[PDB]
Design an enzyme around this catalytic site. Structure first.
Site, PDB file in Angstrom:
ATOM      1  N   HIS A 134       0.803  -1.214   0.000  1.00  0.00           N
ATOM      2  CA  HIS A 134       0.000   0.000   0.000  1.00  0.00           C
ATOM      3  C   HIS A 134       0.837   1.266   0.000  1.00  0.00           C
ATOM      4  CE1 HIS A 134      -3.511  -2.436   0.618  1.00  0.00           C
ATOM      5  NE2 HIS A 134      -3.099  -2.864   1.799  1.00  0.00           N
ATOM      6  N   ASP A 171      -2.697 -10.959  -1.762  1.00  0.00           N
ATOM      7  CA  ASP A 171      -3.302 -10.382  -0.576  1.00  0.00           C
ATOM      8  C   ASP A 171      -4.745 -10.007  -0.887  1.00  0.00           C
ATOM      9  OD1 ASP A 171      -3.950  -7.883   1.193  1.00  0.00           O
ATOM     10  OD2 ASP A 171      -2.128  -8.685   2.108  1.00  0.00           O
ATOM     11  N   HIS A 173      -6.395  -7.460  -0.129  1.00  0.00           N
ATOM     12  CA  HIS A 173      -6.556  -6.049  -0.448  1.00  0.00           C
ATOM     13  C   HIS A 173      -5.833  -5.709  -1.742  1.00  0.00           C
ATOM     14  CE1 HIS A 173      -6.828  -6.153   4.031  1.00  0.00           C
ATOM     15  NE2 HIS A 173      -7.844  -5.337   3.802  1.00  0.00           N
ATOM     16  N   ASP A 264      -4.502 -12.812   4.065  1.00  0.00           N
ATOM     17  CA  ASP A 264      -5.789 -12.383   4.587  1.00  0.00           C
ATOM     18  C   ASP A 264      -6.965 -12.909   3.780  1.00  0.00           C
ATOM     19  OD1 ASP A 264      -4.732 -10.582   2.724  1.00  0.00           O
ATOM     20  OD2 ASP A 264      -4.916  -8.840   4.057  1.00  0.00           O
TER      21      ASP A 264
HETATM   22  C1  LIG Z   1     -10.995   0.554   9.770  1.00  0.00           C
HETATM   23  C2  LIG Z   1     -10.371  -0.546   8.874  1.00  0.00           C
HETATM   24  C3  LIG Z   1     -11.024  -0.484   7.492  1.00  0.00           C
HETATM   25  C4  LIG Z   1      -8.856  -0.431   8.778  1.00  0.00           C
HETATM   26  C5  LIG Z   1      -8.215  -1.596   8.034  1.00  0.00           C
HETATM   27  O1  LIG Z   1      -8.718  -2.715   8.100  1.00  0.00           O
HETATM   28  N1  LIG Z   1      -7.052  -1.406   7.305  1.00  0.00           N
HETATM   29  C6  LIG Z   1      -6.213  -2.271   6.720  1.00  0.00           C
HETATM   30  C7  LIG Z   1      -5.163  -1.868   5.870  1.00  0.00           C
HETATM   31  C8  LIG Z   1      -4.217  -2.771   5.380  1.00  0.00           C
HETATM   32  C9  LIG Z   1      -4.237  -4.130   5.752  1.00  0.00           C
HETATM   33  C10 LIG Z   1      -3.270  -5.103   5.278  1.00  0.00           C
HETATM   34  O2  LIG Z   1      -2.053  -4.891   5.283  1.00  0.00           O
HETATM   35  N2  LIG Z   1      -3.753  -6.393   4.891  1.00  0.00           N
HETATM   36  O3  LIG Z   1      -2.893  -7.316   4.445  1.00  0.00           O
HETATM   37  C11 LIG Z   1      -5.248  -4.494   6.611  1.00  0.00           C
HETATM   38  C12 LIG Z   1      -6.178  -3.602   7.100  1.00  0.00           C
HETATM   39  C13 LIG Z   1      -8.166  -0.391  10.158  1.00  0.00           C
HETATM   40  C14 LIG Z   1      -7.483   0.751  10.609  1.00  0.00           C
HETATM   41  C15 LIG Z   1      -6.832   0.798  11.841  1.00  0.00           C
HETATM   42  C16 LIG Z   1      -6.812  -0.310  12.675  1.00  0.00           C
HETATM   43  C17 LIG Z   1      -7.470  -1.455  12.257  1.00  0.00           C
HETATM   44  C18 LIG Z   1      -8.116  -1.500  11.012  1.00  0.00           C
HETATM   45  K   LIG Z   2      -4.231  -8.232  -3.950  1.00  0.00           K
HETATM   46 ZN   LIG Z   3      -4.226  -7.161   3.028  1.00  0.00          ZN
END
Ligand SMILES: CC(C)[C@H](C(=O)Nc1ccc(C(=O)NO)cc1)c1ccccc1
Ligand SMILES: [K+]
Ligand SMILES: [Zn+2]
Ligand SMILES: [K+]
Length: 358
Positions: A134, A171, A173, A264
């Site tokens: 990201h 992943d 995301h 994930d």
């Molecule tokens: C509110 C929610 C939408 C947010 C979130 O889930 N972000 C997110 C971003 C990247 C990954 C990742 O690296 N996945 O592999 C996973 C999760 C969040 C923010 C702060 C604390 C907990 C959660």
């Molecule tokens: K992906």
């Molecule tokens: Zn992810």
């Protein structure tokens, strides 16, 4: 020359969220992976590769000088200063050791690229945090400071003179940072399969849909596969690789494959919503070993269920090490929603890939 490299350093545990004791991006993510690799006997079968700190010049392949400077300064900030800065980004925390760990996280991937490109190893896996996919040229995002794989791809090109790099992002995301970095670049093909749900799922970007195919010289070299229902299974991922990714990968003929290896999408993840068995990742890893002479480097991205992520890493490692693939209980038959997404992505990419025509 035939071995599988593994990079892990204790520094990867030396940062955590100071203001949220339940934060899911936590040091146990990597220690549980290492503990399971050890108890499964896989760790001892790998070649231990030292990490290294990324240099400024390497970071600047992707990130701006101003951003690198700001990130470097976080090591001297107070907790209040770290929180104020972290809150300027989306889904980010900071810690006085974050920058040092992030530099080793990038460097771990570069170390494996060196070994794989020079045929000292066949393939490798960095068990690294923080994640990278990201992160963007001038900002943190999604628990990432530096874009590990984007740097590794440009490093492979600059140092090892690789012409074409394929980045596969499984992943759950969308790795929008990787997409942005290589938007106009035909020398790095980015493929991402991710939960989308018509934008309902984070990061809620229109650019995560399959209509974003790259632009300019990079037109056709960005491929998004958005899932619009939860509950996808192993057969949905295998089918996507068989129908879409593999045909394009062979046409592209990359000299190195980098994998944004998040877990994930595995059954049990608290956020991903998918139902992929960890064993599926043995098959997906195997399916990628057929291009680039098997020059394949995996780097850990997301995955928040400690056991599910550890199992997914182990399943991938079994394939890197050449063990026969497991039989999948699930039949490789995809669901209707997955087929709809795959067909739509093929529709958006067909003008650019002879392998995707009738
Ligand atoms: C509110 C929610 C939408 C947010 C979130 O889930 N972000 C997110 C971003 C990247 C990954 C990742 O690296 N996945 O592999 C996973 C999760 C969040 C923010 C702060 C604390 C907990 C959660
Ligand atoms: K992906
Ligand atoms: Zn992810
Ligand atoms: K691209």
């Amino acid at each position: 020359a035939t071995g599988t490299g593994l990079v892990y350093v204790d520094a990867f545990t030396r940062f955590h969220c100071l203001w949220d004791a339940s934060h899911p991006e936590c040091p146990a993510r990597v220690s549980t992976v290492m503990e399971m690799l050890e108890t499964e006997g896989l760790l001892g079968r790998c070649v231990q590769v030292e990490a290294r700190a990324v240099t400024e010049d390497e970071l600047l392949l992707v990130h701006t000088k101003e951003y690198v400077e700001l990130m470097k300064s976080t090591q001297n900030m107070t907790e209040e200063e770290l929180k104020t800065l972290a809150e300027k980004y989306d889904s980010v925390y900071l810690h006085p050791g974050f920058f040092s760990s992030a530099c080793l996280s990038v460097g771990s991937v570069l170390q494996l690229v060196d070994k794989v490109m020079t045929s000292q190893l066949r393939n490798g896996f960095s068990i690294n945090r923080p994640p990278g996919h990201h992160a963007q040229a001038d900002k943190m995002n999604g628990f990432c400071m530096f874009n590990n794989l984007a740097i590794a791809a440009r490093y492979a090109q600059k140092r090892h003179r690789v012409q074409r790099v394929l980045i596969v992002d499984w992943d759950v995301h969308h790795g929008q940072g990787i997409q942005y970095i290589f938007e106009e670049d035909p020398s790095v093909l980015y493929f991402s399969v991710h939960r989308y749900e018509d934008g309902s799922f984070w990061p809620h970007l229109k650019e995560s849909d399959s209509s974003s195919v790259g632009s300019g010289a990079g037109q056709g070299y960005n491929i998004n596969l958005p899932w619009n229902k939860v509950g996808m299974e192993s057969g949905d991922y295998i089918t996507a690789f068989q129908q879409l990714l593999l045909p394009v990968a062979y046409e592209f003929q990359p000299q190195l494959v980098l994998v944004a290896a998040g877990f994930d999408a595995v059954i049990g993840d608290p956020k991903g919503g998918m139902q992929v068995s960890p064993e599926c990742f043995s098959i997906l890893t195997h399916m990628l070993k057929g291009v680039a002479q098997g020059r394949l480097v995996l780097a850990l991205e997301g995955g928040f269920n400690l056991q599910s992520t550890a199992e997914g890493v182990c399943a991938s490692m079994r394939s890197l090490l050449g063990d026969p693939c497991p039989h999948l209980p699930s039949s490789g038959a995809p669901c209707e929603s997955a087929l709809k997404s795959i067909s739509k992505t093929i529709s958006d990419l067909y003008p650019f890939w002879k392998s995707l025509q009738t």
